[PDB]
Ligand binder design. Sequence first.
Ligand SMILES: C[n+]1cn([C@@H]2O[C@H](COP(=O)(O)O[P@](=O)(S)OP(=O)(O)OC[C@H]3O[C@@H](n4cnc5c(=O)nc(N)[nH]c54)[C@H](O)[C@@H]3O)[C@H]3OC(C)(C)O[C@H]32)c2nc(N)[nH]c(=O)c21
Length: 180
Amino acid sequence: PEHYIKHPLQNRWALWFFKNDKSKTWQANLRLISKFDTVEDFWALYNHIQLSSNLMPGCDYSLFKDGIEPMWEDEKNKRGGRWLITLNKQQRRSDLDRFWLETLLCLIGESFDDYSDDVCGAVVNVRAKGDKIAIWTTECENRDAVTHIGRVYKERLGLPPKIVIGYQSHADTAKNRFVV
Ligand SMILES: C[n+]1cn([C@@H]2O[C@H](COP(=O)(O)O[P@](=O)(S)OP(=O)(O)OC[C@H]3O[C@@H](n4cnc5c(=O)nc(N)[nH]c54)[C@H](O)[C@@H]3O)[C@H]3OC(C)(C)O[C@H]32)c2nc(N)[nH]c(=O)c21
């Protein structure tokens, strides 16, 4: 078994791409790229696509559990929210790509213990004004789940205690509820 089988991930994941085109509605700009459910298929996908730092501004990547679309409207996102990492323009060079890949591995490696079931997915927004990365969770009222994912996330990105990150509900997005 060991010699020849791919290594299965706990979940099947879908990678999505967004390109800003003012000709189209936001949802029409959102497109699914492919899915994978093994370590080896993840790295084949990742190794084939552009680093976030190399995308034109206005683009997003999103990685979500199969069955969950990367949009507020989805039943598993409507009552939820996101842990938000805001980066300055200098961090495009220094942090964007490494932070995004760490976010990817927190999801597929199920890095948040009993609360990895609350995880829906993650998004990186590439923007001239300042890039963003976020982990989306499914229920903004689940205080223990949300806070625990926030603490683990902050430390896995190696952020200092001088930084604070915020959790915002999509309901208000469409203010911070929690900070760690
Ligand atoms: C995650 N998400 C994002 N959006 C859309 O993206 C925007 C929200 O994201 P955020 O607050 O980060 O803004 P951002 O992504 S930094 O966009 P931006 O301000 O850089 O965009 C530049 C300009 O272009 C406009 N824009 C942005 N995306 C699109 C677009 O896809 N199509 C058109 N026609 N115009 C667009 C936007 O209104 C702005 O004036 C909202 O704009 C509109 C089109 C009104 O819908 C929102 C969403 N819409 C829905 N229904 N559901 C979502 O989950 C969702």
